Short mmCIF file of C-alpha atoms and ligand atoms in Angstrom, two decimals:
data_model
loop_
_atom_site.label_atom_id
_atom_site.label_comp_id
_atom_site.label_asym_id
_atom_site.label_seq_id
_atom_site.Cartn_x
_atom_site.Cartn_y
_atom_site.Cartn_z
CA UNK A 1 -7.38 15.67 62.09
CA UNK A 2 -7.10 13.43 65.15
CA UNK A 3 -7.13 13.78 68.92
CA UNK A 4 -4.11 14.16 71.20
CA UNK A 5 -3.24 11.91 74.21
CA UNK A 6 -3.89 15.01 76.29
CA UNK A 7 -7.33 15.59 74.76
CA UNK A 8 -8.08 11.94 74.83
CA UNK A 9 -7.07 11.87 78.56
CA UNK A 10 -9.16 14.86 79.39
CA UNK A 11 -12.38 13.48 77.95
CA UNK A 12 -11.93 10.23 79.68
CA UNK A 13 -11.46 12.25 83.00
CA UNK A 14 -14.74 14.08 82.32
CA UNK A 15 -16.83 11.08 81.38
CA UNK A 16 -15.35 9.11 84.27
CA UNK A 17 -16.27 11.87 86.56
CA UNK A 18 -19.66 12.43 84.81
CA UNK A 19 -20.34 8.69 85.40
CA UNK A 20 -20.03 9.24 89.20
CA UNK A 21 -23.02 11.42 88.84
CA UNK A 22 -26.76 10.31 88.76
CA UNK A 23 -25.88 7.16 90.71
CA UNK A 24 -28.76 7.36 93.32
CA UNK A 25 -31.66 5.02 92.50
CA UNK A 26 -35.39 5.07 93.47
CA UNK A 27 -35.19 1.67 95.09
CA UNK A 28 -31.94 2.40 97.08
CA UNK A 29 -33.28 5.88 97.88
CA UNK A 30 -34.84 6.58 101.26
CA UNK A 31 -48.89 20.03 95.33
CA UNK A 32 -46.31 20.35 98.23
CA UNK A 33 -45.83 16.50 98.39
CA UNK A 34 -44.86 16.94 94.63
CA UNK A 35 -42.77 20.08 95.44
CA UNK A 36 -40.88 18.71 98.38
CA UNK A 37 -39.96 15.83 96.23
CA UNK A 38 -38.18 18.02 93.61
CA UNK A 39 -36.34 20.06 96.06
CA UNK A 40 -35.19 17.10 97.94
CA UNK A 41 -34.00 15.50 94.64
CA UNK A 42 -32.43 18.78 93.48
CA UNK A 43 -30.06 19.02 96.48
CA UNK A 44 -28.70 15.59 95.74
CA UNK A 45 -28.09 16.65 92.18
CA UNK A 46 -26.61 20.12 93.08
CA UNK A 47 -24.23 18.38 95.54
CA UNK A 48 -23.27 15.98 92.89
CA UNK A 49 -22.60 18.96 90.48
CA UNK A 50 -20.45 20.80 92.95
CA UNK A 51 -18.34 17.62 93.39
CA UNK A 52 -18.10 17.05 89.64
CA UNK A 53 -16.97 20.85 89.47
CA UNK A 54 -14.01 20.26 91.75
CA UNK A 55 -12.81 17.39 89.63
CA UNK A 56 -12.68 19.36 86.43
CA UNK A 57 -9.05 20.85 85.85
CA UNK A 58 -8.62 24.51 86.31
CA UNK A 59 -11.79 25.03 88.52
CA UNK A 60 -10.33 24.68 92.03
CA UNK A 61 -7.53 26.98 91.00
CA UNK A 62 -9.99 29.92 90.49
CA UNK A 63 -10.73 32.14 93.30
CA UNK A 64 -13.70 31.27 95.58
CA UNK A 65 -16.06 34.13 94.84
CA UNK A 66 -16.07 33.30 91.10
CA UNK A 67 -16.37 29.55 91.72
CA UNK A 68 -19.66 30.57 93.29
CA UNK A 69 -20.61 32.74 90.30
CA UNK A 70 -19.97 29.95 87.70
CA UNK A 71 -21.89 27.34 89.82
CA UNK A 72 -24.71 29.57 90.78
CA UNK A 73 -25.80 30.06 87.06
CA UNK A 74 -24.79 26.86 85.28
CA UNK A 75 -26.21 24.40 87.81
CA UNK A 76 -29.73 24.64 86.37
CA UNK A 77 -28.27 24.36 82.81
CA UNK A 78 -26.34 21.24 83.57
CA UNK A 79 -29.51 19.67 85.03
CA UNK A 80 -31.25 20.58 81.73
CA UNK A 81 -28.41 19.01 79.80
CA UNK A 82 -28.66 15.83 81.87
CA UNK A 83 -32.52 15.73 81.62
CA UNK A 84 -32.17 15.92 77.82
CA UNK A 85 -29.54 13.22 77.60
CA UNK A 86 -31.89 10.58 79.14
CA UNK A 87 -35.03 11.99 77.60
CA UNK A 88 -37.06 9.12 76.18
CA UNK A 89 -38.73 9.78 72.80
CA UNK A 90 -41.23 6.96 72.87
CA UNK A 91 -42.62 7.47 76.40
CA UNK A 92 -41.88 11.25 76.59
CA UNK A 93 -40.60 10.78 80.22
CA UNK A 94 -37.49 12.70 81.34
CA UNK A 95 -35.34 10.79 83.76
CA UNK A 96 -33.79 12.45 86.84
CA UNK A 97 -31.00 10.72 88.88
CA UNK A 98 -30.53 7.02 88.23
CA UNK A 99 -34.16 6.02 87.71
CA UNK A 100 -36.87 8.52 88.47
CA UNK A 101 -39.19 9.08 85.42
CA UNK A 102 -41.77 11.79 85.08
CA UNK A 103 -44.03 12.58 82.28
CA UNK A 104 -44.77 16.15 81.22
CA UNK A 105 -48.23 15.56 82.70
CA UNK A 106 -46.61 14.62 86.05
CA UNK A 107 -45.18 18.12 86.17
CA UNK A 108 -48.46 19.94 85.79
CA UNK A 109 -49.58 18.29 88.90
CA UNK A 110 -46.66 19.89 90.81
CA UNK A 111 -48.29 23.18 89.51
CA UNK A 112 -45.26 24.15 87.23
CA UNK A 113 -46.34 26.58 84.45
CA UNK A 114 -46.78 25.78 80.85
CA UNK A 115 -44.46 28.75 79.90
CA UNK A 116 -41.69 26.83 81.85
CA UNK A 117 -42.39 22.90 81.15
CA UNK A 118 -42.93 22.98 77.26
CA UNK A 119 -39.62 24.54 76.51
CA UNK A 120 -37.74 21.99 78.62
CA UNK A 121 -39.31 19.21 76.41
CA UNK A 122 -38.63 21.16 73.18
CA UNK A 123 -35.16 21.38 74.30
CA UNK A 124 -34.90 17.70 75.14
CA UNK A 125 -36.42 16.81 71.78
CA UNK A 126 -34.03 19.25 69.84
CA UNK A 127 -30.87 17.83 71.54
CA UNK A 128 -31.91 14.17 70.88
CA UNK A 129 -32.09 15.10 67.25
CA UNK A 130 -28.45 16.00 67.31
CA UNK A 131 -27.51 12.49 68.50
CA UNK A 132 -24.87 13.24 71.15
CA UNK A 133 -22.83 10.61 72.92
CA UNK A 134 -21.63 10.74 76.52
CA UNK A 135 -18.21 12.22 75.53
CA UNK A 136 -19.92 15.13 73.66
CA UNK A 137 -22.26 15.76 76.54
CA UNK A 138 -19.42 15.67 79.07
CA UNK A 139 -17.37 18.18 76.96
CA UNK A 140 -20.42 20.53 76.48
CA UNK A 141 -21.03 20.56 80.32
CA UNK A 142 -17.48 21.74 81.03
CA UNK A 143 -17.72 24.37 78.41
CA UNK A 144 -20.94 25.48 79.98
CA UNK A 145 -19.40 25.72 83.42
CA UNK A 146 -16.50 28.11 82.28
CA UNK A 147 -18.83 30.77 81.07
CA UNK A 148 -17.18 34.14 81.64
CA UNK A 149 -20.43 35.90 80.59
CA UNK A 150 -22.06 35.01 83.95
CA UNK A 151 -23.06 37.85 86.38
CA UNK A 152 -20.42 39.03 88.77
CA UNK A 153 -17.41 37.27 87.29
CA UNK A 154 -14.27 39.02 88.75
CA UNK A 155 -11.70 37.53 86.32
CA UNK A 156 -13.42 37.00 82.89
CA UNK A 157 -10.26 36.45 80.87
CA UNK A 158 -9.00 33.77 83.24
CA UNK A 159 -12.37 31.91 82.74
CA UNK A 160 -12.34 32.31 78.94
CA UNK A 161 -8.79 30.69 78.96
CA UNK A 162 -10.08 27.76 80.96
CA UNK A 163 -12.92 27.05 78.58
CA UNK A 164 -10.95 27.22 75.31
CA UNK A 165 -9.32 23.71 75.65
CA UNK A 166 -12.80 22.17 75.83
CA UNK A 167 -14.01 23.89 72.76
CA UNK A 168 -10.93 22.86 70.83
CA UNK A 169 -11.43 19.31 72.03
CA UNK A 170 -15.17 19.18 71.14
CA UNK A 171 -14.39 20.75 67.69
CA UNK A 172 -11.83 17.98 66.96
CA UNK A 173 -14.13 15.26 68.44
CA UNK A 174 -16.99 16.23 66.23
CA UNK A 175 -14.73 16.52 63.14
CA UNK A 176 -13.65 12.82 63.64
CA UNK A 177 -17.21 11.55 64.33
CA UNK A 178 -18.73 13.35 61.28
CA UNK A 179 -16.22 14.60 58.75
CA UNK A 180 -18.89 15.16 56.14
CA UNK A 181 -21.27 17.19 58.42
CA UNK A 182 -19.22 20.35 59.09
CA UNK A 183 -22.10 22.36 60.70
CA UNK A 184 -23.10 19.78 63.41
CA UNK A 185 -20.62 21.25 65.86
CA UNK A 186 -22.20 24.86 65.38
CA UNK A 187 -25.64 23.23 65.66
CA UNK A 188 -24.48 21.96 69.12
CA UNK A 189 -23.22 25.40 70.20
CA UNK A 190 -26.54 26.93 69.06
CA UNK A 191 -28.12 24.79 71.73
CA UNK A 192 -26.03 26.58 74.45
CA UNK A 193 -28.02 29.70 73.44
CA UNK A 194 -31.32 27.84 74.03
CA UNK A 195 -30.07 27.07 77.56
CA UNK A 196 -30.03 30.64 78.64
CA UNK A 197 -33.66 31.30 77.70
CA UNK A 198 -34.60 28.22 79.78
CA UNK A 199 -32.29 29.67 82.53
CA UNK A 200 -34.23 33.02 82.44
CA UNK A 201 -37.47 31.28 82.14
CA UNK A 202 -36.51 29.20 85.25
CA UNK A 203 -35.99 32.40 87.24
CA UNK A 204 -39.59 33.36 86.42
CA UNK A 205 -40.88 29.94 87.38
CA UNK A 206 -39.01 29.71 90.74
CA UNK A 207 -40.32 33.17 91.65
CA UNK A 208 -43.97 32.23 90.88
CA UNK A 209 -43.90 29.41 93.43
CA UNK A 210 -42.67 31.71 96.08
CA UNK A 211 -46.19 33.30 95.68
CA UNK A 212 -47.82 29.81 95.83
CA UNK A 213 -46.33 29.30 99.38
CA UNK A 214 -43.55 27.12 98.08
CA UNK A 215 -40.15 28.56 99.32
CA UNK A 216 -36.96 27.10 98.35
CA UNK A 217 -34.60 25.05 100.81
CA UNK A 218 -31.36 26.38 102.26
CA UNK A 219 -29.03 25.16 99.39
CA UNK A 220 -31.30 25.85 96.55
CA UNK A 221 -32.21 29.42 97.75
CA UNK A 222 -28.57 30.34 97.80
CA UNK A 223 -28.07 29.81 94.06
CA UNK A 224 -31.67 30.31 92.55
CA UNK A 225 -33.54 32.98 94.78
CA UNK A 226 -33.00 36.66 94.06
CA UNK A 227 -24.29 34.99 101.70
CA UNK A 228 -23.54 31.43 100.50
CA UNK A 229 -22.96 29.73 103.77
CA UNK A 230 -23.85 26.24 102.54
CA UNK A 231 -22.28 26.77 99.06
CA UNK A 232 -18.85 27.60 100.60
CA UNK A 233 -18.99 24.61 102.84
CA UNK A 234 -19.47 22.33 100.02
CA UNK A 235 -16.70 23.70 98.01
CA UNK A 236 -14.34 23.86 101.05
CA UNK A 237 -13.75 20.07 101.52
CA UNK B 1 -11.66 29.05 48.41
CA UNK B 2 -14.67 31.24 48.88
CA UNK B 3 -17.77 30.96 46.68
CA UNK B 4 -18.85 33.50 44.14
CA UNK B 5 -22.41 33.36 45.67
CA UNK B 6 -20.87 33.74 49.16
CA UNK B 7 -18.91 36.81 48.16
CA UNK B 8 -21.99 38.56 46.88
CA UNK B 9 -23.84 37.89 50.04
CA UNK B 10 -21.13 39.32 52.30
CA UNK B 11 -20.95 42.31 50.06
CA UNK B 12 -24.62 42.96 50.26
CA UNK B 13 -24.57 42.87 53.95
CA UNK B 14 -21.64 45.17 54.53
CA UNK B 15 -23.23 47.73 52.15
CA UNK B 16 -26.50 47.42 54.06
CA UNK B 17 -24.47 47.85 57.29
CA UNK B 18 -22.96 51.05 55.86
CA UNK B 19 -26.30 52.78 55.64
CA UNK B 20 -26.63 52.34 59.33
CA UNK B 21 -25.23 54.94 62.01
CA UNK B 22 -25.17 57.97 59.67
CA UNK B 23 -26.75 60.35 62.29
CA UNK B 24 -24.65 62.76 64.22
CA UNK B 25 -25.10 65.04 67.23
CA UNK B 26 -24.32 67.89 64.99
CA UNK B 27 -26.48 66.87 62.00
CA UNK B 28 -32.89 67.87 63.85
CA UNK B 29 -31.54 67.46 67.38
CA UNK B 30 -32.58 65.04 70.07
CA UNK B 31 -33.34 66.11 73.51
CA UNK B 32 -30.12 67.10 74.94
CA UNK B 33 -27.89 65.50 77.56
CA UNK B 34 -27.88 67.32 80.84
CA UNK B 35 -36.03 66.10 86.15
CA UNK B 36 -32.30 65.25 85.36
CA UNK B 37 -33.37 61.55 85.71
CA UNK B 38 -36.30 62.15 83.39
CA UNK B 39 -34.32 63.95 80.62
CA UNK B 40 -31.73 61.34 80.32
CA UNK B 41 -34.41 58.73 79.73
CA UNK B 42 -35.92 60.79 77.07
CA UNK B 43 -32.49 61.18 75.41
CA UNK B 44 -32.03 57.47 75.22
CA UNK B 45 -35.52 56.67 73.86
CA UNK B 46 -35.43 59.29 71.01
CA UNK B 47 -32.05 57.99 69.92
CA UNK B 48 -33.31 54.39 70.12
CA UNK B 49 -36.40 55.16 68.09
CA UNK B 50 -34.06 56.47 65.40
CA UNK B 51 -31.73 53.24 65.66
CA UNK B 52 -34.67 50.83 65.46
CA UNK B 53 -35.78 52.26 62.07
CA UNK B 54 -32.38 51.66 60.58
CA UNK B 55 -32.26 48.21 61.82
CA UNK B 56 -35.72 47.52 60.13
CA UNK B 57 -34.32 49.07 56.84
CA UNK B 58 -31.16 47.05 57.18
CA UNK B 59 -33.23 43.81 57.75
CA UNK B 60 -35.24 44.24 54.67
CA UNK B 61 -31.96 44.50 52.67
CA UNK B 62 -31.03 41.22 54.29
CA UNK B 63 -31.82 38.41 51.69
CA UNK B 64 -34.60 36.07 52.50
CA UNK B 65 -35.91 38.12 55.41
CA UNK B 66 -38.65 39.34 53.15
CA UNK B 67 -39.15 35.75 51.97
CA UNK B 68 -40.72 35.34 55.51
CA UNK B 69 -44.23 35.94 56.57
CA UNK B 70 -44.98 39.44 58.00
CA UNK B 71 -45.79 37.87 61.29
CA UNK B 72 -42.50 36.04 61.56
CA UNK B 73 -40.42 39.09 60.22
CA UNK B 74 -41.93 40.99 63.18
CA UNK B 75 -41.17 38.24 65.67
CA UNK B 76 -37.65 37.98 64.64
CA UNK B 77 -36.98 41.76 64.61
CA UNK B 78 -38.41 42.57 67.92
CA UNK B 79 -36.34 39.92 69.69
CA UNK B 80 -32.94 40.75 68.04
CA UNK B 81 -33.33 44.50 67.97
CA UNK B 82 -31.63 44.92 71.34
CA UNK B 83 -29.08 42.23 70.41
CA UNK B 84 -28.19 44.05 67.20
CA UNK B 85 -28.02 47.33 69.11
CA UNK B 86 -25.56 45.77 71.65
CA UNK B 87 -23.40 44.31 69.00
CA UNK B 88 -23.06 47.83 67.64
CA UNK B 89 -22.12 49.28 70.99
CA UNK B 90 -19.38 46.65 71.19
CA UNK B 91 -18.09 47.16 67.83
CA UNK B 92 -17.00 50.67 68.44
CA UNK B 93 -15.88 50.46 72.17
CA UNK B 94 -12.91 52.52 72.89
CA UNK B 95 -10.71 50.64 75.49
CA UNK B 96 -8.65 53.86 75.95
CA UNK B 97 -11.60 55.85 77.09
CA UNK B 98 -14.10 53.01 78.09
CA UNK B 99 -16.75 55.04 76.32
CA UNK B 100 -19.28 53.08 74.15
CA UNK B 101 -20.59 54.77 71.04
CA UNK B 102 -24.08 55.02 69.59
CA UNK B 103 -25.25 55.87 66.16
CA UNK B 104 -22.56 58.03 64.29
CA UNK B 105 -20.82 59.82 67.26
CA UNK B 106 -22.74 59.77 70.62
CA UNK B 107 -20.21 58.79 73.15
CA UNK B 108 -21.10 57.85 76.69
CA UNK B 109 -19.11 56.87 79.91
CA UNK B 110 -20.01 54.05 82.22
CA UNK B 111 -20.40 56.86 84.73
CA UNK B 112 -23.06 58.51 82.56
CA UNK B 113 -25.27 55.46 82.64
CA UNK B 114 -25.13 55.23 86.45
CA UNK B 115 -26.17 58.91 86.31
CA UNK B 116 -29.14 58.00 84.08
CA UNK B 117 -30.43 55.85 86.86
CA UNK B 118 -29.54 52.44 85.33
CA UNK B 119 -28.98 49.39 87.67
CA UNK B 120 -25.54 47.81 88.01
CA UNK B 121 -26.87 44.47 86.94
CA UNK B 122 -27.72 45.95 83.55
CA UNK B 123 -24.73 48.22 83.08
CA UNK B 124 -21.88 45.94 84.10
CA UNK B 125 -22.62 43.13 81.38
CA UNK B 126 -22.68 45.76 78.59
CA UNK B 127 -19.11 46.97 79.11
CA UNK B 128 -17.99 43.37 79.94
CA UNK B 129 -19.55 42.34 76.60
CA UNK B 130 -17.88 45.16 74.79
CA UNK B 131 -14.55 44.21 76.42
CA UNK B 132 -15.11 40.53 75.67
CA UNK B 133 -15.98 41.24 72.02
CA UNK B 134 -12.77 43.23 71.62
CA UNK B 135 -10.65 40.20 72.80
CA UNK B 136 -12.09 38.38 69.85
CA UNK B 137 -11.23 41.28 67.47
CA UNK B 138 -13.82 40.88 64.76
CA UNK B 139 -13.62 42.54 61.40
CA UNK B 140 -16.51 44.14 59.63
CA UNK B 141 -17.41 41.15 57.52
CA UNK B 142 -17.44 39.15 60.60
CA UNK B 143 -19.72 41.42 62.59
CA UNK B 144 -22.25 41.53 59.71
CA UNK B 145 -22.31 37.87 59.18
CA UNK B 146 -22.87 37.42 62.98
CA UNK B 147 -25.83 40.05 62.85
CA UNK B 148 -27.52 38.26 59.99
CA UNK B 149 -27.11 34.96 61.90
CA UNK B 150 -28.64 36.63 64.96
CA UNK B 151 -31.74 37.62 63.08
CA UNK B 152 -32.64 34.25 61.83
CA UNK B 153 -32.98 32.47 65.15
CA UNK B 154 -35.73 29.73 65.15
CA UNK B 155 -36.10 29.56 68.88
CA UNK B 156 -37.26 33.14 69.11
CA UNK B 157 -40.79 33.70 70.79
CA UNK B 158 -43.79 33.37 68.49
CA UNK B 159 -41.92 32.19 65.43
CA UNK B 160 -44.37 30.22 63.21
CA UNK B 161 -42.11 28.79 60.64
CA UNK B 162 -38.80 27.83 62.54
CA UNK B 163 -37.64 25.44 59.65
CA UNK B 164 -37.88 28.21 57.16
CA UNK B 165 -36.02 30.63 59.46
CA UNK B 166 -33.27 28.08 60.24
CA UNK B 167 -32.99 27.40 56.56
CA UNK B 168 -32.21 31.03 55.89
CA UNK B 169 -29.64 31.07 58.72
CA UNK B 170 -27.43 28.03 57.60
CA UNK B 171 -26.09 29.94 54.51
CA UNK B 172 -24.66 32.70 56.74
CA UNK B 173 -23.21 30.25 59.18
CA UNK B 174 -21.58 28.51 56.32
CA UNK B 175 -20.24 31.97 54.91
CA UNK B 176 -18.90 32.77 58.37
CA UNK B 177 -17.24 29.49 58.77
CA UNK B 178 -15.76 29.75 55.22
CA UNK B 179 -14.59 33.28 55.73
CA UNK B 180 -12.89 32.57 59.06
CA UNK B 181 -11.09 29.65 57.38
CA UNK B 182 -9.81 31.76 54.73
CA UNK B 183 -8.78 34.85 56.77
CA UNK B 184 -7.32 32.91 59.62
CA UNK B 185 -6.55 29.22 58.71
CA UNK B 186 -4.59 28.41 61.90
CA UNK B 187 -7.20 29.89 64.44
CA UNK B 188 -9.80 27.07 64.64
CA UNK B 189 -11.48 28.34 67.97
CA UNK B 190 -12.13 31.80 66.65
CA UNK B 191 -15.29 30.85 64.90
CA UNK B 192 -16.98 28.83 67.81
CA UNK B 193 -16.41 31.81 70.23
CA UNK B 194 -18.34 34.14 67.77
CA UNK B 195 -21.25 31.68 67.81
CA UNK B 196 -21.03 31.50 71.59
CA UNK B 197 -21.36 35.42 71.74
CA UNK B 198 -24.95 34.74 70.70
CA UNK B 199 -25.39 33.01 74.08
CA UNK B 200 -24.15 36.30 75.99
CA UNK B 201 -26.62 38.50 73.84
CA UNK B 202 -29.49 36.37 75.25
CA UNK B 203 -28.54 36.98 78.93
CA UNK B 204 -28.10 40.64 78.05
CA UNK B 205 -31.40 40.74 76.24
CA UNK B 206 -33.10 39.27 79.41
CA UNK B 207 -31.15 41.64 81.80
CA UNK B 208 -32.19 44.49 79.55
CA UNK B 209 -35.89 43.37 79.94
CA UNK B 210 -35.63 43.55 83.67
CA UNK B 211 -34.06 47.10 83.50
CA UNK B 212 -37.07 48.35 81.27
CA UNK B 213 -39.51 47.23 84.04
CA UNK B 214 -37.62 48.69 86.86
CA UNK B 215 -37.61 52.06 84.94
CA UNK B 216 -41.38 52.06 84.72
CA UNK B 217 -41.15 52.07 88.64
CA UNK B 218 -39.17 55.29 88.24
CA UNK B 219 -41.97 57.03 86.39
CA UNK B 220 -40.08 56.42 82.98
CA UNK B 221 -42.46 54.69 80.48
CA UNK B 222 -41.25 53.97 76.99
CA UNK B 223 -42.55 55.60 73.83
CA UNK B 224 -45.03 53.62 71.55
CA UNK B 225 -42.53 52.05 69.20
CA UNK B 226 -40.06 50.84 71.80
CA UNK B 227 -42.92 49.64 74.05
CA UNK B 228 -43.91 47.25 71.37
CA UNK B 229 -40.47 45.59 71.08
CA UNK B 230 -39.38 45.83 74.92
CA UNK B 231 -42.50 45.93 77.13
CA UNK B 232 -44.54 43.14 78.72
CA UNK B 233 -47.08 45.67 66.79
CA UNK B 234 -49.02 48.41 64.94
CA UNK B 235 -45.99 50.77 64.33
CA UNK B 236 -43.58 47.97 63.57
CA UNK B 237 -45.98 46.45 61.17
CA UNK B 238 -46.30 49.86 59.48
CA UNK B 239 -42.50 50.26 59.34
CA UNK B 240 -42.09 47.18 57.42
CA UNK B 241 -44.60 48.24 54.77
CA UNK B 242 -42.91 51.21 53.10
C1 D43 C 301 -39.66 20.94 87.55
C2 D43 C 301 -38.02 20.67 87.28
C3 D43 C 301 -37.62 21.07 85.89
C4 D43 C 301 -37.31 21.00 88.38
N1 D43 C 301 -36.61 22.41 88.37
C5 D43 C 301 -36.71 23.42 89.23
O1 D43 C 301 -36.09 24.40 89.13
O2 D43 C 301 -37.33 23.00 90.30
C6 D43 C 301 -38.41 23.92 90.96
C7 D43 C 301 -39.43 22.90 91.46
C8 D43 C 301 -39.01 24.77 89.89
C9 D43 C 301 -37.70 24.61 92.07
C10 D43 C 301 -35.40 22.17 87.53
C11 D43 C 301 -34.89 20.82 87.99
C12 D43 C 301 -35.99 20.23 88.94
C13 D43 C 301 -35.81 20.35 90.37
O3 D43 C 301 -35.52 21.48 90.98
N2 D43 C 301 -35.75 19.05 90.96
C14 D43 C 301 -36.07 18.21 90.02
C15 D43 C 301 -36.25 16.77 90.15
C16 D43 C 301 -36.49 15.97 89.17
C17 D43 C 301 -36.55 16.51 87.84
C18 D43 C 301 -36.44 17.81 87.69
C19 D43 C 301 -36.21 18.71 88.79
C1 D43 C 302 -29.02 52.58 78.39
C2 D43 C 302 -28.68 52.23 76.98
C3 D43 C 302 -27.92 50.94 76.90
C4 D43 C 302 -29.85 52.29 76.02
N1 D43 C 302 -30.61 51.09 75.97
C5 D43 C 302 -31.67 50.74 76.68
O1 D43 C 302 -32.31 49.58 76.35
O2 D43 C 302 -31.96 51.67 77.54
C6 D43 C 302 -33.33 52.05 77.97
C7 D43 C 302 -33.14 53.10 79.10
C8 D43 C 302 -34.15 50.71 78.37
C9 D43 C 302 -33.96 52.67 76.67
C10 D43 C 302 -29.89 50.22 75.01
C11 D43 C 302 -29.44 51.14 73.93
C12 D43 C 302 -29.49 52.61 74.52
C13 D43 C 302 -30.84 53.35 73.97
O3 D43 C 302 -32.02 53.02 73.95
N2 D43 C 302 -30.37 54.57 73.49
C14 D43 C 302 -29.08 54.77 73.60
C15 D43 C 302 -28.28 55.77 73.26
C16 D43 C 302 -26.87 55.73 73.44
C17 D43 C 302 -26.24 54.65 74.03
C18 D43 C 302 -27.15 53.52 74.44
C19 D43 C 302 -28.52 53.60 74.20
#
């Protein structure tokens, strides 16, 4: 009933890597005005997500066409995990990147649909109730990435094997943090289930804006719209 | 050790699970497996109608489901119907033949489904889930617990009493946890993977919904009872009443 040096070492690598993310600030930073803002800001985040993904052990070792498959699906779900981490209960303003803060009302002005926005905030509220630290968020992101249930995964068993170390670490970490509360760990996992619904709802939202004359940029269209020239280039570096 | 209350609950579930999948191709008869496109669709829908009713009967036997409001019961059943069905496809997947089985003994190839006009996006995940489920290697108690856990999801659409639903689920999660510990003390990661399979059921259920809409474009519209649960609840409300 205690972590290993290997497990301790991995968690530190993840949070350290995770800390390199969301570094860009609104001061330091250089309908459609609202839209362009989001897409612009997504590209920054996506690019950070790919970089984070190379750092994690056992990811670069996978073949390229499955590295695409895991990233394509999880990238939105990571974003959602990160929006939830910095969700502020008092203001009800989700933070994106270092310091960009947006109320739920701010989103309606971008023309996002109520079927899409409310679940995001319900997700952010629900996760805040769990009370996860940076280590638990970092482990949960990794677990999320190595999802072998994603569409068009060529080597599922290889991916399942990569993920299992992160589950075992998270199980042991939660047991130490709350020995009395045995079901908090399952509660955290049941949240992974909520992420998919939001992932499917997101595919409906993105589509709807294509109708409103709001087409996605080159990088974001590769992974969200129904070749991966940009995506290969980011991975190959 | 396992609780006396917990033993009863598992026992009630497995028994209820036993009443499911009693129908045989030999035992009335559903429209036969072979216009050709149209007939295969019919074959599936008649069989599914039959399956849905057993799931509904099973769900009433599950404890505390009937504690719920008729509106919530309906919400819960409609969303998990496909997910229970797919658990069952996986449960009895033959790795030797790669043929999934439906009800008592209706066996189908991957090849068959392509022939029925189903899209790859839909078909591939189903066999992958059946394969992935096998790697876990669940026993009957474990399947049944996982099913009951599935039913009581608070984050389902149109649920009115989430807390009441989630309260009914925790007992089952606790039983599954306790059961895994007793049966396999040294395998700590087995129990989380089972819970994570619920994540896979969601993607499937979403993929399945897309398939149903694509089929409507093939001039293949679902019958009344399946249309309630899968299209975008009079018969289902009436089914609960018996
Ligand atoms: C509305 C948001 C939830 C945005 N989402 C999204 O898919 O964007 C579309 C505009 C629908 C294409 C998900 C992440 C999103 C984004 O893309 N950029 C961004 C910047 C700050 C906060 C949140 C976001
Ligand atoms: C294609 C199948 C996977 C069938 N399902 C489904 O949703 O397909 C529709 C065409 C939309 C109806 C899911 C269970 C399904 C069914 O309805 N009857 C049936 C009989 C034997 C095996 C599998 C099935």
